[PDB]
Each structure stands twice: as C-alpha cells, then as structure tokens.
Write an enzyme that holds these catalytic residues in place. Structure first.
Site, PDB file in Angstrom:
ATOM      1  N   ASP A 105     -40.876-111.539  -2.118  1.00  0.00           N
ATOM      2  CA  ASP A 105     -41.894-111.950  -3.106  1.00  0.00           C
ATOM      3  C   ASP A 105     -43.294-111.392  -2.917  1.00  0.00           C
ATOM      4  O   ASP A 105     -44.265-111.980  -3.392  1.00  0.00           O
ATOM      5  CB  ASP A 105     -41.916-113.487  -3.217  1.00  0.00           C
ATOM      6  CG  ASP A 105     -42.897-114.149  -2.266  1.00  0.00           C
ATOM      7  OD1 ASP A 105     -43.094-113.680  -1.114  1.00  0.00           O
ATOM      8  OD2 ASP A 105     -43.508-115.145  -2.686  1.00  0.00           O
ATOM      9  N   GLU A 106     -43.393-110.273  -2.204  1.00  0.00           N
ATOM     10  CA  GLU A 106     -44.665-109.659  -1.822  1.00  0.00           C
ATOM     11  C   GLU A 106     -44.575-108.161  -2.019  1.00  0.00           C
ATOM     12  O   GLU A 106     -43.564-107.562  -1.630  1.00  0.00           O
ATOM     13  CB  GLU A 106     -44.915-109.861  -0.324  1.00  0.00           C
ATOM     14  CG  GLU A 106     -45.583-111.145   0.039  1.00  0.00           C
ATOM     15  CD  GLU A 106     -45.930-111.241   1.514  1.00  0.00           C
ATOM     16  OE1 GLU A 106     -45.777-110.247   2.259  1.00  0.00           O
ATOM     17  OE2 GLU A 106     -46.397-112.315   1.923  1.00  0.00           O
TER      18      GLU A 106
END
Ligand SMILES: Cc1cn([C@H]2C[C@H](O)[C@@H](COP(=O)(O)OP(=O)(O)OP(=O)(O)O)O2)c(=O)[nH]c1=O
Ligand SMILES: *Nc1ccc2c(c1)Cc1ccccc1-2
Ligand SMILES: [Ca+2]
Ligand SMILES: [Ca+2]
Ligand SMILES: [Ca+2]
EC number: 2.7.7.7
Length: 341
Positions: A105-106
């Site tokens: 998620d980054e």
DNA sequence: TTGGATGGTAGAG
DNA sequence: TAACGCTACCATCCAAC
C-alpha cells in the site's frame, strides 16, 4: 529533488468498507484467524473508528475483543486487497516512470522532472488523490519532500486522507525537533540504545563520536542517521526486486510428529510455488516457530534452481534437521525461497 | 589476508 | 495469547594460494 510518497489509508479495512458501505463510520477490524481455538490469531489492521479504542495491527484478536467487543471482525482476504493494490499501483505509474513500490500500500514517485516546484507537486498530489478516489473509491495520504524519508514522514503527519509538503525549512525544523523514534527504520530497540547515548533528536547525531554510534547501532544505521541529520540523504527511487517468496502456517496443535507436520509444510511449499511466477529459486529455508515463539530456521543453497518436487524432499530434511537440533515443540512451520535465477 | 553461505535480529508493511 | 510477510543488516565461520 522532489519525491511524492503515497500510502493508502487503513488499507485492508478500507477495502472492506468499499465492498460493504454499511461498515463505513463504524469500528471494523481485519483479522488473521489461525485455527488454534475460538478467535485465535492477530489483527492485521483496523479502521480509525476501531483504533480510538486501542485496536490495531499486531494485537491478538482476544485482546481486541476485550477492549472493543462491539466491532465488525472480518477475516483477512489478502487476494482481494492485492487486486485493489495492483490497479492503484498501475494508476500511479501513469504519473511517473521512476516509481518504487515499497509495500502492498505504499509507493514513492520521483517527480523531479514532472513538476518545477512544491506548489506544482502539491497540485499533482491532489490529482493523484482525486484519480484514485474516482477509480477505486480509496482515500490515500500523500507526502511530498526532498527525499524518500521526509516524504514518508510527511505522509505520517498528514494521515488519514491527507496531503503534506515538508519544504526545506521544515526539514531543518524536523532535524531539530522530530523524536528520533519517528524516523523510518528506527524502532523500539534502536531508539532505546539511542536514548542511552543521549540521542533523542536527529540533530543529536551530529555531536556524537562516529564510532561510539557505530559501536552501538552498527555502521549502516549510523551512516543513515548522520546523512539524514546532515540534510544530505538522497537515495534514488529504484524498482524493488523481490528477493524471497515464502509462506508460514499455524498448526492446529503444537507437534514434533514429522508426519503430522508434513502436510502443513507441503501446503506452504505449494502456496510458495504459485507466487514465484516464473522465478526459479536456488535456495530454500525452512522456518519453525517453537512453543515459546522463538524463530528457528535451516536452509540449503544449490548451484542450480530447485524444482517444486525437489523442494518437497529438501524441506523434509531441513525440518528433520530442526527437529534433531531443537527439542522444543513446533507451533508454526514455513518455507521460503530465494536467490532467484 | 575477505568472502558466500548461515542463521538470527530489527523494523519504512 | 501473541498472523503473516519480507528486506537490510549483523555476527560468525570455515575457507584463503
Ligand atoms: C502494520 C501492518 C500492516 N498490515 C497490512 C494491513 C494494512 O492495511 C496494510 C498497510 O499497512 P499500514 O500502511 O502500516 O497500515 P494501514 O494502511 O492499515 O493504516 P494507516 O492509515 O495508518 O496507514 O498492510 C498487516 O497485515 N500487519 C501489520 O502489522
Ligand atoms: N511471513 C513469513 C513467511 C515465511 C517465512 C518468514 C516469514 C521468515 C522465514 C524464514 C525462513 C523460511 C521461511 C520464512
Ligand atoms: Ca497505509
Ligand atoms: Ca503503509
Ligand atoms: Ca519507529
């Protein structure tokens, strides 16, 4: 030098909210149930409503239920979150070819050649947020600064659904004022060691003898912190290359029975091999988590790739090794593949 | 007259 | 009552022409 960092908000929990909108605005906890007994396992994450009550990543489900019985507890559906992630990561690719996917998620984008200044960077951050919200109905936080570390710190300050620039003047303030614990890569253990050297802020690292810091936290971390404190850190955005692919499963009951353990191990191999996706590994490691949650591993490296069938028989011998060299009963068993061709 | 393999540690998930 | 996953780094080590 302009780096834009994206971190998706309460990610697994927010995906569950998009799937079931009646969840939005009430406590949601995403769990890893493990089989052992009623509600055994750990929390993967929780939405902000649930966090207000102390529920967050890492804690046992039984403890979460003590402090927050009222919430929706949901089984982790990793496959679904990866699908959502992949689509978003492909959206981000459209804003810059220099991208570094850091996690599920980054991602960091080097936008130095896309925007002239921080004002334009900020407008691009909003376009990205708007686009992701349009296409996936997912809110994200954007951090913008001169390098990766400060861009990530910018997102931490702005979480959830935020956007933040840390300009050159605020970088200088944070070197002075930011609790060193809050610097990426500095965890509880490193922080406590730093507490002993008098080091509480990034700036404190400038006055300390370099080998006393080295003799305390090691070369790489000492170099890291000093470079950050010097306002010199400038590590490039680079494509991440997978180094290992693994799976670990919790056995229903603790065991030292090889035949009882094998099905779990084979399941871990089968699953690992699916995720390899054309990669051919030359090393295999077996991992055992013992009754007291110590982690023990044994591996073997070949001059050539390991076939799936070969992995089965090699893993057995590695597990026989662990069982012969450690008397404790095994609670979790897993396998990892590395050194890809 | 330094190095790949080895297993453990720490932490930006 | 404590999941699952993966990287960078650390010591240690048995080999070193
Ligand atoms: C930290 C952590 C994350 N994860 C997974 C679930 C998270 O949704 C996902 C992203 O990690 P994070 O970005 O650390 O957490 P988050 O997105 O849930 O919450 P935040 O708003 O504070 O950014 O990775 C775990 O499974 N276990 C963990 O211990
Ligand atoms: N999440 C996870 C999965 C597999 C493995 C680890 C973590 C550590 C390790 C060590 C050796 C083999 C396999 C694994
Ligand atoms: Ca996040
Ligand atoms: Ca994250
Ligand atoms: Ca920290």
């Amino acid at each position: 030098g302009i780096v834009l960092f994206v971190d998706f908000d309460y990610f697994y929990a927010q995906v569950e909210e998009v799937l079931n909108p009646s969840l939005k605005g009430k406590p949601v906890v995403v769990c890893v149930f493990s089989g052992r007994f009623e509600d055994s396992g750990a929390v993967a994450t929780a939405n902000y409503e649930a966090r207000k009550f102390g529920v967050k990543a890492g804690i046992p489900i039984v403890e979460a239920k003590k402090i927050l019985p009222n919430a929706v507890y949901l089984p982790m559906r990793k496959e679904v979150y990866q699908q959502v992630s992949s689509r978003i990561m492909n959206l981000l690719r459209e804003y810059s070819e220099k991208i570094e996917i850091a996690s599920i998620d980054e991602a960091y984008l080097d936008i130095s050649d896309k925007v002239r200044d921080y004002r334009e960077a900020y407008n691009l951050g909003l376009e990205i947020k708007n686009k992701i919200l349009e296409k996936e109905k997912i809110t994200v936080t954007v951090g913008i600064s001169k390098n990766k570390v400060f861009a990530k710190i910018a997102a931490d300050m702005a979480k959830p659904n935020g956007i933040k620039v840390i300009d050159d003047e605020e970088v200088k303030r944070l070197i002075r004022e930011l609790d060193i614990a809050d610097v990426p890569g500095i965890g509880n253990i490193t922080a406590e060691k730093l507490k002993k050297l008098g080091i509480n802020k990034l700036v404190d690292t400038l006055s300390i003898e370099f080998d006393k810091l080295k003799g305390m936290i090691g070369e790489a971390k000492a170099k890291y912190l000093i470079s950050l404190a010097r306002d010199e850190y400038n590590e490039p955005i680079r494509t991440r290359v997978r180094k290992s692919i693994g799976r670990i499963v919790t056995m229903k009951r603790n065991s030292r029975n090889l035949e009882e353990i094998k099905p779990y191990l084979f399941r871990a191999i089968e699953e690992s091999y699916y995720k390899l996706d054309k990669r051919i590994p030359k090393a295999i490691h077996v991992v055992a988590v013992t009754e007291d949650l110590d982690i023990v591993s044994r591996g073997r490296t070949f001059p050539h790739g390991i076939s799936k069938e070969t992995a089965y028989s090699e893993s057995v011998k590695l597990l026989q090794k662990i069982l012969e060299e450690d008397e404790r009963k095994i609670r979790r068993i897993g396998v990892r593949f590395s050194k890809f061709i």
